[PDB]
Each structure stands twice: as C-alpha cells, then as structure tokens.
C-alpha cells in the first residue's frame, strides 16, 4: 500500500491505484509495480482506494516503490481548500519577484504552483 | 426554426468565390479537350 506522509501529520492509502506526478511525468502504480525511487514533483496527487479517487495537492517529496508493493511516499505539507485567486495575485507579485535573481527560482516555483492550481 | 438569419460572409468569402468561377471556365476547356478522341 501507500505511505503518504506530511510533517506533523501523515495520511496514506494496497498500491493498486495511485496516480503520482513524478520525474518521469505521471506514473500510475497499481499493486506490484517495479521498484523505483522517483522524486515526486510539486504535485496534484490522486490516491484511489478501489477506483474511488481522492485528490490531493502535495508540495512534492519522494516516492520509492519498495519491491513488496509498499509505495513509500514521504511528502511535506498539502488540495481543494488551498486551490480555492490570491495565490494567482501572489504569482503576479512573483512577477515583481523575478527582478531578484534564489528569488528567480522562487518566482519560478510560484509560476509552477499557479500552473498546478490551473491543473486543478 | 430554420429561418434566414443574415450572414455577411460576402467579402469574407469573396476570394473563394472568384476562384470557383475561374475553375468553372478552365474545366470547361479541360472537359472539352478530354471529350475529343
């Protein structure tokens, strides 16, 4: 199964349906999958127990299938609440933030996160 | 239901219509040339 975690709090649910945004694009893991170590990108994550799917906003982390179908996911803070336009306005502030070059990467992350909201 | 609702597609499709007329004349000559032995 899954091992999805967060710093204060951890929630994760046999490996039979997780759709993950990974360095290799998006990866779906169902039951046994080949054992991998893949960095989870800043993400929209879907976890399916059955085919019923619950959709998560995830700050990225790491994914590592252990060969026993244990999808060890370790990830930081989270979603439908966090998605719900001040982050978009903040992305415009991140446009003024691009005038500072770590700050370029930060502003880039803000664009990525705005893109991730658009993905939602 | 159906009804004539005007579409001013005149000058929009003006270059399209000119080409049709030219080809109408040219195919007359081509068809006539093919209808010979």
């Amino acid at each position: 199964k899954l091992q999805f975690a967060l710093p204060h709090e951890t929630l994760y649910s046999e490996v039979t349906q997780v759709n993950l945004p990974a360095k290799s694009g998006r990866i779906g893991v169902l039951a046994n999958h080949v054992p991998t170590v893949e960095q989870l990108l800043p993400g929209v994550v879907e976890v399916m127990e059955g085919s019923n799917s619950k959709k998560f906003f995830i700050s990225g982390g790491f994914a590592t299938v252990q060969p026993d179908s244990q999808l060890c996911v370790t990830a930081i803070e989270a979603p439908l609440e966090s998605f719900s336009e001040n982050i978009k306005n903040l992305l415009a502030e991140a446009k003024k933030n691009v005038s500072s070059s770590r700050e370029a990467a930060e502003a880039a992350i803000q664009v990525e996160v705005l893109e991730n909201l658009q993905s939602v | 239901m159906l009804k004539r609702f005007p579409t001013p597609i005149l000058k929009v499709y003006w270059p399209f219509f000119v080409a049709g007329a030219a080809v109408y004349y040219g195919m007359s000559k081509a068809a006539d040339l093919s209808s010979n032995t």
Binding site: - | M1, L2, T7, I9, V12, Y13, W14, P15, F16, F17, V18, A19, G20, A22, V23, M27
Partner: protein, 224 residues
C-alpha cells in the same frame, strides 16, 4: 441529366433532413440523433474557436463545416454495394481543394497585403539562407493545394476498387472444387471487413480536411 446530378440532389435532401426531419420541434431535451449534431457542432466550434480564435474565430466556421459535411455524407453514399460516384468522381474533390487554396492565397494578399509574403519567411534564420526559406516555404504552401485534395480522392476510390474486384473473384472462388464450399464463408468475411474500413477512413477524411483547412488558414491569416 447525369447520374452524378441525381446524387448531388440526393446529398442536398439528406442534409436538409438532418435539420428538419430528425429534430422534433426544436425540443430542449433533444432527439437521440440530435445529440450527435450538437457534439459535432461544438467540437468543430471549439476547434475553430481554438485554431482561429480571432475576431473571425467563427466567421470561417460555416466554410470549415460545409467542408466537413460534404466529405462526411458523400463517403457514406458511395460505399453502399451499388452506387456510382460523388467523391469517387475526383474532379469535384480536386477542384474544390484548389479553389479553397486559391481563395486562401487571394485572401492573404487582400487581407494582409504584400506582407502576405512575410508568410514565406515564417522564421528568422541567417540572412544568406533567408531567400532559400522563401522558395521552399512558398513551394510547401502550394503543396497544400494538391495534398489536401489527393488524399481524400485516392482513399475513397481505392476502397471501391478493392471491394468490387475482390467481390467478382470470390464469386468464382466458390466455383472451384467443393472443398472451397467448405470454408466458403471465409472470403465473405474478408469483403465485410474491407467494406467496414472504407466507411471509416472517409469519415476520418471529412474531419481531417476540416482541421487541415483550418491549419493552412491559420498560417495564412496569422502571418508566419
């Protein structure tokens, strides 16, 4: 008249029936048939809202739609076991393609002047090969004239020719010794599969026309 003339009349009467005698009363909930003509309308609407998407996004929606519909109906009628030619009469298809191409070239010149020729430098490239990139862009521009027409004509024609030639041979295939009447069903199944395929690539061609003649116009309207 002419057999072709009779079938052009038949196409007109079919198309009228799709908007007069398949839609009961302009019902809000709609007919089960009418769900199709909502979806088709919307997926070419949202395609030319995407592709063109200007202040003329949908001013070329009737043209791109009647290029869909012509090819869509005339590649069903000609596929029936007995039927003559509409789109298998190539002179209508090739002429129609060249007409649209000329109507793009003239439209581009009219609408966008001699900066129509800015279409034929679609990319900034080093200056000693800027003139080269005009020669084989304009060459590729009037390749669109015949590429578009010859694709559709050949497919429909090739389908009819394959079916009929194989049908005459398989009649005589059953007339060899009685061991051919054992497994006399197998050539019938092959002809059935070919007939199914000949409907499919023609419906694909009506859509492919209507996206490709959005693309050539995309290049022409939005210079480069």
């Amino acid at each position: 008249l002419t057999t072709f003339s009779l079938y052009t009349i038949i196409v007109l009467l079919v198309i009228t029936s799709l908007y007069t005698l398949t839609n009961n009363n302009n019902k809000i909930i709609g007919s089960r048939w009418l769900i199709s003509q909502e979806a088709i309308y919307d997926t070419i609407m949202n395609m030319t809202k995407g592709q063109i998407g200007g202040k003329n996004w949908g001013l070329y929606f009737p043209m791109i739609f009647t290029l869909f519909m012509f090819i869509f109906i005339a590649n069903l009628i000609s596929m029936i076991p007995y039927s003559f030619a509409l789109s298998a009469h190539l002179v209508f298809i090739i002429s129609l393609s060249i007409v649209i191409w000329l109507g793009n070239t003239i439209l581009g010149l009219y609408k966008h002047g001699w900066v129509f020729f800015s279409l034929f430098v679609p990319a900034g490239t080093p200056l000693p090969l800027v003139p080269l990139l005009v020669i084989i862009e304009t060459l590729s521009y009037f390749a669109r004239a015949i590429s578009l027409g010859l694709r559709l004509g050949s497919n429909i024609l090739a389908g009819h020719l394959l079916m009929v030639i194989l049908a005459g041979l398989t009649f005589n295939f059953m007339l060899i010794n009685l061991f051919t009447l054992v497994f006399g069903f197998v050539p019938l199944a092959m002809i059935l599969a070919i007939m199914m395929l000949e409907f499919a690539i023609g419906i694909i061609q009506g859509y492919v026309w209507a996206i490709l003649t959005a693309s050539y116009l995309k290049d022409a309207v939005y210079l480069h």
